[PDB]
Design a protein around this ligand. Structure first.
Ligand SMILES: [Mg+2]
Length: 913
């Protein structure tokens, strides 16, 4: 018909490309039923047609927690699945073995383990998700008139449809993709969508293309909307990020591997025991096979780590809470760890690593650079009056007394920030001075002039403009702390060289001058516009250079990140020169190999290569300018294909694909766009890089704590498996009942995990490089430690299980009572050995300092008191553990058996054996 989605092609094509084939912006009128006076026909069918054919501006919104989804995700844990199958088996087998079919104590503990895991994960993730939903919800959209025949004024941005001409002013936000149909020096801030720091100047013929989700930095004009909804570049980017799948955290896969290994070992050994013992029974209605089967499922239960999911969830939740105590928010528990293993960090430039606000970086004043610092009073007074009386923009709340917020174009904002830094107060600066005449900033005439009648009789003429023309129009200057001085040829050459060097860097160049011409008044003149405002013999005050600078204290953070083995690179859509300058300032890119192709490549060069040939180079890309969002996605994909655990810190919508495809996507809390924050696993509410370093440290500490608990849990499981298997083959009885060890796993894990988690992160973790993504979760040192502890426990508990009635005093006064007492001694000595092994694991690979934290002591007291209560009283607690009362001598024997763990733990720590 007439632009049936050909308009998406028009926008896709190069700037000012393919728009001439359609007759230009005006030719596009009468197409899409657009009239410059009437953007919409009077009827509503004329709007429904645009809603249907060209779509609607509403973007679909993702929905989470639809129906207990997080509980299902928790249930999908592989180790948890092993636990569920073992739990069902044991419950049915025991309930048939006893035949009572009353109560749920036999499998109650094993069911409660997974129930607790599910509940804890669901609660923690629900809280985190709702908190993130509340925080990230930012009303960036600004509702405005649509300007179509003066009808349906002030409709929400979601009601704008293709074919209607909407107006845009300074500070507004471009709602939908469009082409400007008229304007007055309009200029957009596309840094959100394209990543270019400098504002883009839009013309009705040169660059007639306005992008959705853009901030109008300067000027104003009316624009025809072309793309709305998914058809927009914003919409298309949001569409190319929806699909998420094939993800598994390195920690998650490592835990799955360890759980699968231990579970397979347990299953194999239990099956061997079952087969051998059945052969013994048959040859060595029901034939007592049920008792053997309950023994076998008990062995299988003690084999698998029941409390591992509980401990990992508790550690991740505690570390997420501690991170949120800092100014970094983690969306999911798993992410809390994945950032520790990150091997490279790709950081946006505009918004991330740079304030994104133009401000003065250097300056000139009194014949000297005198960058920032504090200017002399004599020159400072004139400079501040000129900055106050020659700027259209103004500070938001000088009268109110709150934090100052600047307005106007980035040039005006930076000049005003400089004036404020110099000690200017806008309320008073504007006072004591009346603007007789004001010729504002003009594209035709670069300079901007003003006439200020100071409180004194004489009147000043201020000129703020481009450095070259202002300098050419001035023949004198105000030297430091002194009166006017003629500018000699050498001084003019010095100023011009300074301006040229300043322009060599990314920063722009704005110069201020003042002429003391007086004795005449603009009001006395018949017409203010007729005031020539003479431009001759000006006196230069201070040349000022304004650029988008690196965030404060970002170079040091990058230095720390690099020291931690985590390389940092920059992926940005800004031109190569600006990216190179900002990288050098921020420390990402060192001085050497600055211009080499691998060190910095443009987006087009990177994408030209095949996905196979985008990998031999992706390992060296330190900077990347003019990179499209798909090029950021390609870089992330290539880095991941090479085995990197890529983190991406970005703010704009262009970074959304890179954030999503990345292993760990970090998004700035305030600067970040809604799309970037949605696709990020962590959103940095600090808007700072020190928070990123802290997050890396917290992830490494989380991994260390998980490793320590894994050591402890493997010790417990491998001691109990041996004890039960040997006891079953030797006599057919299991000392460690299923419920006893289920309680041990549950309580000891849920308490010791957080007890070790109390260890605050230490800078030591930053010294070592990141984990290799392939090293086993259980390092050989942890294997030796857990093996030594498990061997000791096996030895003591087996010698007890076999000779305890004789070894323990008061031997066999009643055989059943003596057997129960011996089993209780074995069980609670096992518990105490586990507690003291937790003590050891708190500070591994060194001599224990034996100085715990208050919370650790409190939880040790809790463990001791709960164990003592469980053993000592058999009613309402200890019924299921089947434990008989113990006398003081027996309890002393148990605490001695536990204490013996510490010396051998130390010996194993200090001996490679
Ligand atoms: Mg950005």
């Amino acid at each position: 018909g007439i632009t049936p989605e050909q308009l998406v092609i028009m926008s896709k094509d190069h700037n000012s490309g393919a728009l001439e084939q359609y007759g230009g912006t005006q030719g596009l009128a009468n197409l899409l039923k657009t009239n410059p006076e009437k953007g919409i026909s009077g009827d509503d069918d004329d709007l429904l047609k645009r809603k249907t054919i060209y779509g609607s501006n509403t973007y679909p919104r993702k929905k989470g927690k639809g129906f207990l989804r997080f509980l299902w995700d928790a249930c999908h844990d592989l180790t948890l699945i092993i636990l569920m199958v073992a739990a069902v088996a044991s419950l049915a087998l025991g309930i048939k073995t006893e035949g009572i079919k009353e109560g749920w104590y036999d499998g109650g503990s094993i069911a409660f383990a997974v129930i607790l895991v599910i509940v804890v994960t669901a609660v923690s993730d629900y809280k985190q998700s709702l908190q993130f939903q509340n925080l990230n919800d930012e009303k960036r959209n600004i509702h405005l008139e649509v300007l179509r025949g003066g009808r349906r004024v002030e409709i929400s941005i979601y009601d704008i449809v293709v074919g209607d001409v909407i107006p845009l002013n300074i500070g507004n936000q471009v709602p939908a993709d469009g082409v400007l149909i008229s304007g007055h020096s309009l200029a957009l801030d596309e840094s959100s969508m394209t990543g270019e720091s400098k504002i883009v100047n839009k013309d009705a013929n040169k660059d007639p293309f306005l992008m959705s989700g853009c901030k109008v930095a300067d000027g104003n004009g009316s624009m025809l909307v072309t793309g709305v909804g998914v058809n927009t570049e914003w919409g298309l980017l949001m569409a190319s990020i929806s699909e998420d799948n094939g993800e598994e955290t390195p920690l998650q896969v490592r835990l799955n591997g360890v759980a699968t290994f231990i579970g397979s070992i347990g299953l194999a050994v239990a099956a061997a025991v079952l087969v051998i013992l059945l052969t013994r029974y048959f040859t060595g209605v029901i034939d007592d096979v049920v008792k053997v089967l309950t023994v076998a499922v008990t062995i299988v239960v003690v084999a698998v780590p029941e409390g591992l999911p509980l401990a990992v969830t508790l550690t991740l939740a505690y570390s997420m809470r501690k991170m949120m105590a800092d100014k970094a928010l983690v969306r999911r528990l798993s992410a809390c760890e994945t950032m520790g293993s990150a091997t490279t960090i790709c950081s946006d430039k505009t918004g991330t690593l740079t304030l994104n606000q133009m401000t003065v970086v250097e300056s000139y004043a009194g014949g000297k650079k005198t960058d920032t610092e504090q200017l002399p009073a004599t020159i400072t007074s004139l400079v501040v009056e000129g900055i106050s009386q020659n700027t259209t923009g103004s500070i938001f709340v000088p009268e109110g007394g709150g934090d100052l917020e600047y307005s106007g174009s980035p040039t005006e904002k930076a000049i005003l920030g400089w004036g404020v830094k110099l000690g200017m107060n806008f309320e008073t600066a504007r006072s004591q001075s009346s603007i007789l005449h004001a010729f504002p900033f003009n594209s035709e005439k670069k300079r901007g002039g003003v006439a200020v009648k100071t409180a004194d009789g004489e009147v000043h003429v201020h000129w703020k403009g481009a450095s070259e023309i202002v300098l050419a129009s001035c023949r004198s200057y105000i030297d430091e702390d002194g009166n006017v001085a003629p500018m000699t040829d050498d001084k003019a050459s010095f100023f011009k060289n300074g301006i040229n060097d300043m322009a060599g860097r990314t920063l722009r160049c704005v110069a201020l001058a003042f002429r003391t011409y007086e004795a005449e008044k603009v009001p006395t003149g018949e017409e203010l516009s007729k005031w020539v405002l003479p431009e001759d013999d000006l006196i230069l005050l201070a040349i000022v250079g304004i650029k988008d600078p690196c965030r404060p204290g970002v170079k040091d953070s990058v230095v720390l990140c690099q020291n931690a083995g985590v390389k940092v690179r920059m992926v940005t859509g800004d031109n190569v020169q600006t990216a190179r300058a900002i990288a050098l300032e921020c420390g990402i890119l060192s001085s050497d190999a600055d211009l080499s192709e691998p060190t910095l490549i443009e987006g087009k060069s990177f994408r030209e290569m095949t996905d196979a040939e985008r990998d031999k180079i992706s390992d060296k890309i330190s900077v990347m300018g003019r990179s499209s969002p798909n090029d950021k996605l390609l870089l992330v994909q290539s880095l991941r294909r090479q085995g990197h655990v890529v983190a991406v810190t970005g703010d704009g919508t262009n970074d959304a694909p890179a954030l999503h495809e990345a292993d760990i996507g970090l998004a700035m809390g305030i600067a970040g766009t809604e799309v970037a924050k949605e696709s990020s696993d962590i959103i940095i509410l600090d808007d700072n890089f020190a928070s990123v370093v802290k997050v890396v440290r917290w992830g490494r500490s989380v991994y260390a704590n998980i490793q320590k608990f894994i050591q402890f849990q493997l010790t417990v499981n491998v001691a109990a498996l041996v004890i039960n298997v040997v006891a079953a083959i030797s006599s057919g009885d299991v000392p460690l009942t299923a419920v006893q060890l289920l309680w041990v796993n549950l309580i000891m894990d849920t308490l010791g995990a957080l007890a070790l988690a109390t260890e605050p992160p230490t800078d030591h973790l930053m010294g070592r490089p990141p984990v290799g993504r392939k090293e086993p979760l259980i390092t050989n040192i942890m294997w030796r430690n857990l093996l030594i502890q498990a061997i000791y426990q096996v030895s003591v508990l087996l010698t007890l299980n076999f000779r305890g009635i004789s070894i323990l005093g008061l031997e066999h006064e009643v055989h059943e009572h003596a057997t129960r007492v011996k089993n209780t001694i074995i069980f609670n000595a096992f518990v105490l050995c586990q507690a003291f092994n937790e003590f050891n694991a708190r500070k591994p690979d060194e001599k224990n300092i034996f100085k715990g934290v208050i919370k650790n002591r409190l939880f040790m007291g809790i463990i001791v008191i709960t164990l003592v209560l469980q053993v000592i009283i058999v009613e309402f607690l200890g019924k299921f553990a089947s434990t008989t009362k113990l006398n003081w001598k027996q309890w002393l024997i148990c605490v001695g058996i536990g204490v013996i763990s510490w010396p051998l733990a130390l010996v194993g720590k200090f001996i490679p054996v």
